[PDB]
Amino acid sequence: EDGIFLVLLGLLMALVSWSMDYVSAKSLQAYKWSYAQMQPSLPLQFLVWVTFPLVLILFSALFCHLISPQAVGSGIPEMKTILRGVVLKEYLTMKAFVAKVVALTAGLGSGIPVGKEGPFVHIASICAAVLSKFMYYSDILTVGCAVGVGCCFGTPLGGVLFSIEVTSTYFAVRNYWRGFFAATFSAFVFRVLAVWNKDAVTITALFRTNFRMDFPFDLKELPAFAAIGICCGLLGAVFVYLHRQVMLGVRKHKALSQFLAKHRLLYPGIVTFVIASFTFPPGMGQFMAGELMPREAISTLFDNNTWVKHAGDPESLGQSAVWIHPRVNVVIIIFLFFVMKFWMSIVATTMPIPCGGFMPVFVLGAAFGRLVGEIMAMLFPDGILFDDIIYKILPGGYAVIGAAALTGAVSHTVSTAVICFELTGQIAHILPMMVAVILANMVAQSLQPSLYDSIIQVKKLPYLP
Amino acid sequence: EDGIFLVLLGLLMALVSWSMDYVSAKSLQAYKWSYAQMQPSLPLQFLVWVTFPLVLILFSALFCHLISPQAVGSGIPEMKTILRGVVLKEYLTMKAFVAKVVALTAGLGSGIPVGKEGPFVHIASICAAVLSKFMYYSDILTVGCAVGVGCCFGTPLGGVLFSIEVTSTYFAVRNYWRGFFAATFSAFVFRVLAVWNKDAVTITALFRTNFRMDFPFDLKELPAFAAIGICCGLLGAVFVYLHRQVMLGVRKHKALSQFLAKHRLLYPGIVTFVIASFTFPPGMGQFMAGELMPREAISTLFDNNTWVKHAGDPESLGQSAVWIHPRVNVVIIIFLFFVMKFWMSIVATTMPIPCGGFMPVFVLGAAFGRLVGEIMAMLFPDGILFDDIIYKILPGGYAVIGAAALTGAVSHTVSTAVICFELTGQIAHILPMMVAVILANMVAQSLQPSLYDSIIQVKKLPYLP
Numbered sequence: 050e051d052g053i054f055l056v057l058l059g060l061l062m063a064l065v066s067w068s069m070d071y072v073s074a075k076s077l078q079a080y081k082w083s084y085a086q087m088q089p090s091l092p093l094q095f096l097v098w099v100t101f102p103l104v105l106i107l108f109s110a111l112f113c114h115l116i117s118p119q120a121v122g123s124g125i126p127e128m129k130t131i132l133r134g135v136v137l138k139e140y141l142t143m144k145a146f147v148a149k150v151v152a153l154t155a156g157l158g159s160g161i162p163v164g165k166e167g168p169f170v171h172i173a174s175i176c177a178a179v180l181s182k183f184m185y186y187s188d189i190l191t192v193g194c195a196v197g198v199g200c201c202f203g204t205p206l207g208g209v210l211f212s213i214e215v216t217s218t219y220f221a222v223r224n225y226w227r228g229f230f231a232a233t234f235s236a237f238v239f240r241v242l243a244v245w246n247k248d249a250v251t252i253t254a255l256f257r258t259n260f261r262m263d264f265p266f267d268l269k270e271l272p273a274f275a276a277i278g279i280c281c282g283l284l285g286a287v288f289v290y291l292h293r294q295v296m297l298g299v300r301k302h303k304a305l306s307q308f309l310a311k312h313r314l315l316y317p318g319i320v321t322f323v324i325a326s327f328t329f330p331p332g333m334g335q336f337m338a339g340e341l342m343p344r345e346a347i348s349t350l351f352d353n354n355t356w357v358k359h360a361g362d363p364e365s366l367g368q369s370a371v372w373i374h375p376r377v378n379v380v381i382i383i384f385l386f387f388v389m390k391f392w393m394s395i396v397a398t399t400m401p402i403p404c405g406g407f408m409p410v411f412v413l414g415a416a417f418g419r420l421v422g423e424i425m426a427m428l429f430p431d432g433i434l435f436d437d438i439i440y441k442i443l444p445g446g447y448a449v450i451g452a453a454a455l456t457g458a459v460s461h462t463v464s465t466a467v468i469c470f471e472l473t474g475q476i477a478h479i480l481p482m483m484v485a486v487i488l489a490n491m492v493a494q495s496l497q498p499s500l501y502d503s504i505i506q507v508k509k510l511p512y513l514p
Numbered sequence: 515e516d517g518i519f520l521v522l523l524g525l526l527m528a529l530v531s532w533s534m535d536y537v538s539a540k541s542l543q544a545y546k547w548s549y550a551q552m553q554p555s556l557p558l559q560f561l562v563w564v565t566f567p568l569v570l571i572l573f574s575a576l577f578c579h580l581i582s583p584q585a586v587g588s589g590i591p592e593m594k595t596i597l598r599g600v601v602l603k604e605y606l607t608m609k610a611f612v613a614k615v616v617a618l619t620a621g622l623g624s625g626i627p628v629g630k631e632g633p634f635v636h637i638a639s640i641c642a643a644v645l646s647k648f649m650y651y652s653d654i655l656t657v658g659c660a661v662g663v664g665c666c667f668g669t670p671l672g673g674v675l676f677s678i679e680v681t682s683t684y685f686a687v688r689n690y691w692r693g694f695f696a697a698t699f700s701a702f703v704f705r706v707l708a709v710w711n712k713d714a715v716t717i718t719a720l721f722r723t724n725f726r727m728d729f730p731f732d733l734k735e736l737p738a739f740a741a742i743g744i745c746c747g748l749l750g751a752v753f754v755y756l757h758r759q760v761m762l763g764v765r766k767h768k769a770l771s772q773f774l775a776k777h778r779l780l781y782p783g784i785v786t787f788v789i790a791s792f793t794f795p796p797g798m799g800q801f802m803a804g805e806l807m808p809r810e811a812i813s814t815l816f817d818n819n820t821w822v823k824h825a826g827d828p829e830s831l832g833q834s835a836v837w838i839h840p841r842v843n844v845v846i847i848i849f850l851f852f853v854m855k856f857w858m859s860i861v862a863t864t865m866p867i868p869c870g871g872f873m874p875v876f877v878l879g880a881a882f883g884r885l886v887g888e889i890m891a892m893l894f895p896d897g898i899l900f901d902d903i904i905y906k907i908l909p910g911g912y913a914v915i916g917a918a919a920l921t922g923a924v925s926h927t928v929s930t931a932v933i934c935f936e937l938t939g940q941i942a943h944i945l946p947m948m949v950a951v952i953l954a955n956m957v958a959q960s961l962q963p964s965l966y967d968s969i970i971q972v973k974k975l976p977y978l979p
């Protein structure tokens with residue numbers, strides 16, 4: 050019967066993931082078009098920029114309130130609690146499935162720092178439970194997690210490895226085989242649908258990069274990759290620390306908690322309003338590449354161009370031209386993007402909506418990575434002679450490493466190295482990604498608990514040692 | 515103390531692996547040069563072609579006999595037995611380490627189908643045990659296996675995943691973390707040494723390929739990838755079946771066993787002599803690309819050229835020119851290579867030397883893969899129009915899939931998909947590799963037990979259910 054269960058779980062999740070991306074994309078196109086149509090008047094540009102995401106976030110928060118409060122958050126803290134032996138039954142119901150899928154879709158389409166992966170671990174877990182009931186949570190949820198990550202982005206190995214790291218002491222080998230099968234199948238279907246819908250041509254990586262694959266880096270820049278690893282460790286520790294402090298403040302502050310406890314939806318309202326206010330292009334958005342939606346932030350941060358060099362005509366960068374302000378060195382623009390998004394990301398992940406920190410952190414990591422890359426590009430401008438031609442620093446490589454390393458530091462995982470290279474489609478940098486991730490973890494684990502463990506402690510979940 | 519143990523295990527194995535490759539390479543250069551120096555006289559070309567490998571194989575077999583009989587074979591059947599709870603103490607001694615490393619090196623340098631990976635799982639396992647004793651076999655050997663594969667080729671994930679599949683029921687998460695760390699570190703050092711010794715320039719994949727990474731295949735050829743998967747399943751089942759029959763025959767036949775039991779070294783002698791006799795270039799080697807040593811068989815089978823099209827001047831193929839006989843379609847040459855090597859590989863893996871079937875099967879798989887690729891290249895010669903240019907079938911992709919799939923079928927593993935793409939350095943074909951491997955396993959597991967399990971049964975090892 051496993052053949053039926055595993056195929057249907059895999060297939061149905063491929064369809065949920067694909068449909069969600071389809072709709073999310075349409076929301077963002079509607080947003081950009083609507084904004085563009087107001088081009089001659091700043092008050093209307095502001096109105097659109099801000100109200101479009103207020104509507105979607107308030108809808109998301111409200112929908113969960115009305116259908117299933119258990120849909121709020123990333124799921125993973127509760128799934129871990131269940132894997133440890135305490136069955137929080139209320140998080141594996143069809144009501145949560147509906148609330149989660151609907152509200153998440155609305156959230157993603159807003160442009161607000163809301164991840165997708167976290168929620169998919171939960172969505173797949175529920176599906177696995179429901180199919181099983183229709184037709185032993187340690188095995189249901191383990192397969193679920195692998196499928197969730199797999200179908201979320203089209204990243205099979207990422208999923209399987211994740212399903213191991215989320216366990217307690219012992220992992221059953223039988224789940225390795227079941228998870229691997231289902232996650233691979235699901236990912237395959239997901240990418241084929243993209244081709245069918247004229248958005249891929251062949252089966253490809255989700256955020257495919259275009260690095261040289263020929264002398265991709267020298268040994269002389271390995272110290273930079275190592276430095277990114279260590280720095281990501283520290284940044285990750287800070288991210289988690291501050292996240293905790295925000296959650297506790299909102300819940301415990303003597304007066305704030307009285308107010309927000311009654312007037313629900315103020316918190317979503319205000320958080321969203323402020324993030325939108327700062328990102329408006331004519332205001333600070335021009336200094337933060339604020340026109341970029343999460344996927345475009347990734348697409349441009351993993352570019353193969355060297356922004357500090359592309360003078361004369363910035364339009365030659367295509368979409369990446371958004372980073373080249375007429376009066377500000379691109380290094381500063383990257384710095385400001387990182388800093389501003391850092392706190393926006395922390396706060397956004399505390400809103401009462403479906404959300405997660407994987408993709409927010411991934412982007413912050415990429416930004417940090419280019420900051421390092423673009424700076425070295427100004428220090429070693431001459432390049433290296435090999436086989437009669439000159440090879441130069443390729444900052445996109447640093448972005449890829451930074452994304453993996455910071456994610457690692459925040460979650461306490463090494464699976465992120467794999468998810469990241471499956472997303473880019475190129476493995477020129479495997480060994481330095483893996484080393485940077487290990488270093489990031491050694492540092493982060495010595496300072497602060499995983500993001501998920503901080504949440505488990507804060508929410509006082511019945512997590513057995 | 516784990517920090518010391520894991521670093522030293524990782525480091526020392528990187529040095530054993532690197533040193534072994536260094537020496538193996540020198541033996542092969544000596545072999546080819548010596549052969550070339552006899553160019554005007556066929557009797558001397560024959561003498562060199564054959565006697566060079568007789569000396570090395572007989573040395574290998576003899577050395578193990580004299581130092582440690584327990585060094586013979588692939589180790590893995592015994593390591594699995596130990597992981598199940600029966601401590602075959604005699605296979606984790608320094609005597610085995612010495613016999614194994616010395617005899618293996620000699621074997622690899624002969625050009626005879628002798629793998630490297632199997633033996634490295636064992637070599638690393640012994641090192642892990644010895645360091646531990648110097649300073650709980652389930653944890654010693656699990657880390658050992660990850661390091662073995664890691665340092666063998668420079669393939670971290672391959673190692674970690676392998677260390678899971680070799681276990682019984684439960685895998686300890688703590689070993690995931692220890693193995694991942696050590697295998698990554700070891701692989702890193704291994705590749706850096708290659709750069710230092712002027713054999714890499716940067717850190718690279720071991721057998722780096724050069725595929726387009728742009729429209730790498732169409733959906734219309736996915737049925738071929740699937741067909742390779744299924745066929746590999748069947749071929750794998752046959753390989754294992756025949757391997758078993760040979761082992762049993764040698765041990766049980768009424769008269770043969772009497773003879774060979776006394777006159778040791780006849781079996782190595784005769785097997786080696788025959789494999790050499792058939793591969794001699796002026797004889798059948800010209801119809802089997804017999805000039806190629808294992809690594810060159812891989813390098814040319816994973817080429818980015820289309821051999822059935824490269825008419826006019828075969829020298830434009832460089833090294834791959836060896837496959838283009840003046841009077842024989844390259845498809846036949848590939849076919850004969852596959853068939854002849856298939857039985858040579860089976861028999862070679864029964865000799866009383868350090869050896870294994872991973873790399874032999876890997877090559878057979880690659881050959882089969884191109885056979886499919888090169889044939890389709892003659893059926894769909896027109897190509898596909900995309901972005902104003904024409905894309906055509908790229909058979910090297912089929913070779914990569916075939917290598918992974920056949921290996922999968924023979925061992926009953928999916929980790930081979932990962933080892934394979936880490937070896938090529940390109941992940942354009944991840945999803946079709948993974949699907950082909952899954953299909954190969956579904957077929958093979960329905961027909962015959964893993965190569966290793968057949969051996970465990972044949973040798974009557976005390977393998978608890």
Ligand SMILES: [Cl-]
Nearest residue numbers: 122123404405
């Ligand atoms: Cl969360």
Ligand SMILES: [Cl-]
Nearest residue numbers: 164405407408
């Ligand atoms: Cl996320």
Ligand SMILES: [Cl-]
Nearest residue numbers: 587588869870
């Ligand atoms: Cl063997």
Ligand SMILES: [Cl-]
Nearest residue numbers: 629870872873
């Ligand atoms: Cl091998």
